[PDB]
Amino acid sequence: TDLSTFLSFPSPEKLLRLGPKVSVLIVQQTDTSDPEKVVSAFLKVASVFRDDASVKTAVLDAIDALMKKAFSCSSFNSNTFLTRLLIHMGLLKSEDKIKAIPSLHGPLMVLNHVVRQDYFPKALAPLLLAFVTKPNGALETCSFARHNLLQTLYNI
Amino acid sequence: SMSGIALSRLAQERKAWRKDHPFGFVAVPTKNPDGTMNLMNWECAIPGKKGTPWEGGLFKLRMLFKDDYPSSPPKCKFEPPLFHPNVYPSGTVCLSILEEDKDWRPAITIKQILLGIQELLNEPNIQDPAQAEAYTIYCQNRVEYEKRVRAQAKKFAPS
């Protein structure tokens, strides 16, 4: 109902408004077995991330709920998740030729957190490493988030 | 919307290929459920370039042509998909000459296409991958990579 207006036009404000149960809502109004689905909910929520304590907590909790459930469902294929994820972030080209998200600071800040979590399948690390560490990829500079991510990834 | 010109070059292409095609290579028009030929959908095979770790493997790919051909290049898809940095998980091959908006020409003949794809196997364009697995292994552990390729060639060797 109202969660649908947040997903159409992600916003840090609209996010806070969903209330203390955004964790449960996102997990419910989302098909956590379809890789393409989860990727969309991930990127969207991830584009709302920000340093503000209020928001930061909300976004990372929602993601934890979303991905924890996703990576748990046997039917869910993490490789497709990653692959499609790299796709939407415009790191990995595709056949459908999907139009990549505008900014990448949000997903990269969330990915560092995500990757540090247990629910994250460690065999995905290197694939992600290779594209986040791809020197000529969409990533064009000395990102701050990029360094932490990368550091965490090699550390794995 | 105008396949009359297509079925025409596909017919002289079918001929040219027969008078002289590369060794071990295969390229033949599939058969329609009725029994008649179909110069639109082709079943091919490329044997690993000798000396490379692809050596001895028979790699089958499908060649689908649009009603645009030769204005447009065909869609070459490996059946099944192959472990290779420039091959999509779907099987589709990502080569510069198979993109109408790029190095593709109506002059390009099947023999030229299958050969270009044979070359692409040993010499991949890692600058722009179409698959994550092959790419990751290629950059991080280039030796494990070759091992994977050899095991894949063997798996596709004529049994």
The experimental technique behind this entry is: X-ray
Task: Based on DSSP, count helices (H) and strands (E) in chain B, helices before strands.
Answer: 4, 4
Chain position carrying tokens 């589709």: B92
- Continuous segment of H or E residues that includes residue B39: strand B37-47
Q: In chain A, how many domains are there?
A: 1
Cα Rg of chain B, angstroms:
16
Which residues make Cβ contacts (< 8 Å) with residue A27, sequence separation at least 6?
A65, A66, A69
* CATH class as words, domain B1-159: alpha beta
Nearest CA distance, B20 vs chain A (angstrom): 33
Nearest CA distance, A93 vs chain B (angstrom): 6
For the annotated catalytic residues of B, the residue numbers are 94
SS3 A29: coil
What is the 8-class DSSP label of residue B87?
B
| Phi, psi angle pair for B66, to nearest 5° | -80, 180
3-state helix, strand, coil in chain A (%, to 5): 65, 0, 35
Resolution, angstroms, 1 dp: 2.5
| Phi, psi angle pair for B55, to nearest 5° | -50, 130
Neighbours of B156 (CB within 10 A): 20
List the structure tokens of B156: 């596709």
Half-sphere exposure of B58 (CA within 13 A, CB side): 11
Which is nearest to B139 in space by CA: B127, B121, B151? B127
Q: What is the largest CA-CA distance in chain A?
A: 42
Helix residue spans in B59-131 (DSSP H): 110-122
For chain B, domain boundaries = 1-159
Domain that holds residue A85: 1-156
User: CB burial class (10 A; 0-12, 13-18, 19+) of residue A122?
Assistant: exposed
**CATH assignment at residue A71:** 1.25.40.200
> How far is Cα B40 from Cα B43, in angstroms, rounded to an integer?
10
Contact A95 B140 (CB under 8 A): no
Contact B128 A93 (CB under 8 A): yes
List the structure tokens of B31: 């058969």
A129 neighbourhood in chain B, CB within 8 Å: 136, 140
Chain B residue with minimum CA distance to A93: B130
